[PDB]
A paper describes a structure:
Single-domain antibodies (sdAbs), including camelid-derived nanobodies and human-derived variable heavy domains (VH), have emerged as a transformative class of biologics due to their small size, high stability, and superior tissue penetration. Derived from Staphylococcus aureus, Protein A is a 42 kDa surface protein consisting of five homologous immunoglobulin-binding domains (A–E) and an S region that functions as a signal sequence and cell wall-binding region (XM). It strongly interacts with the CH2-CH3 region within the Fc domain of IgG1, IgG2, and IgG4 and can also bind certain antibody fragments. Using this approach, we successfully reprogrammed multiple human-derived VHs and camelid-derived nanobodies to acquire high Protein A affinity, enabling efficient, tag-free purification via industry-standard Protein A affinity chromatography.
Next, we co-crystallized n501 with the domain D of Protein A and successfully determined their complex structure at a resolution of 3.57 Å. IgGM accurately predicts the interaction between n501 and Protein A (DockQ = 0.834, RMSD = 1.29 Å), whereas AlphaFold-3 incorrectly docked Protein A to the CDR (DockQ = 0.028, RMSD = 13.11 Å). Analysis of the crystal structure reveals that the interaction between n501 and domain D of Protein A is predominantly mediated by FR1 and FR3. The domain D of Protein A contributes an additional 12 residues to the binding interface, including A28, Q29, G32, F33, Q35, S36, D39 from helix II, N46, V47, E50 from helix III, and K53 from the interloop connecting the two helices.
Author numbering:
A (entry chain D), B (entry chain A): 1 to 120
C (entry chain H), D (entry chain B): 2803 to 2856
Amino acid sequence: EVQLVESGGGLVQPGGSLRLSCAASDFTFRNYEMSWVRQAPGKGLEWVSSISGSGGSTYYAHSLKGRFTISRDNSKNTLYLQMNSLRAEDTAIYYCARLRDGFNNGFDYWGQGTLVTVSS
Amino acid sequence: EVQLVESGGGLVQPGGSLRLSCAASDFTFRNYEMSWVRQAPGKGLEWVSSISGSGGSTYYAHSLKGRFTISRDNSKNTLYLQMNSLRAEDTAIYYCARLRDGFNNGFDYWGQGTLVTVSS
Amino acid sequence: FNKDQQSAFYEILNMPNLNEAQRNGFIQSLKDDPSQSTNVLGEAKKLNESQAPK
Amino acid sequence: FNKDQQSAFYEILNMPNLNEAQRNGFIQSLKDDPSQSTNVLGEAKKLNESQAPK
């Protein structure tokens, strides 16, 4: 019974910074590669970031390179995403996903997600 | 373009009741399935309730079954959610969301949200 | 280990047009993943540049 | 450049019981005068220990 839960997020004015947390349970979590994806209004899913099972390999997209940062604590079963220089386009529902077998076989479990609204 | 707005909500003492209304515009309201979800500040999203395009199919979550109730008026382009026997844990920002291509396929447009506070 | 990390840290400490939240945010980014030290600095100096009323 | 400097840099950067203002303050002190780095590390640890709860 795998379960992931997101935490953090809310209303911030443009140019600010946030930090998101993801709490996993009921699996090893240090054997699976993890990923963050977001969903803007009106558009499809957009991939954001990923981290390897052990750490030490982090993958980012171009819409957010230099602004976001991913990290994981395999001893607390936790995965963090740090947001900086936030813009109005970054408002979305952010999801925490487990990849089976690396980048090869897709996602199998999601979170409930968390909402990030950026306005004035 | 699609536009949704939430209305109603505010401060009530514990054990009280409120009623939320959602006004949709600029799309066919009777073909898409709608839902209400809530998020407390600083924590993630929680799914609350959902109804099919025509009505007559209603699904609720386990924390609030028998306490909240969902309904839709396809002739007024309106969607209602009534809350009863409110507790202090039920305080959050409530959002009105449209599901694309049925239930299990996610969200593409939500509203601005409204605040529900339950305290003494 | 990475000297570029430490140099970008001191680079960001003395940026005038940032406020405490943005300064600490880019510092936290240097903490989580020290490989992006160059990229973070690029987007930090950019933001500082946009916050000057000169 | 100074080997005494950077080891105290990473020591103070990873001090848990400080808050962001104290961390950045002692680290800025390591920049202003690299000769006092050892002393800077002593008074930060001393503060960090006294600000930890059980």
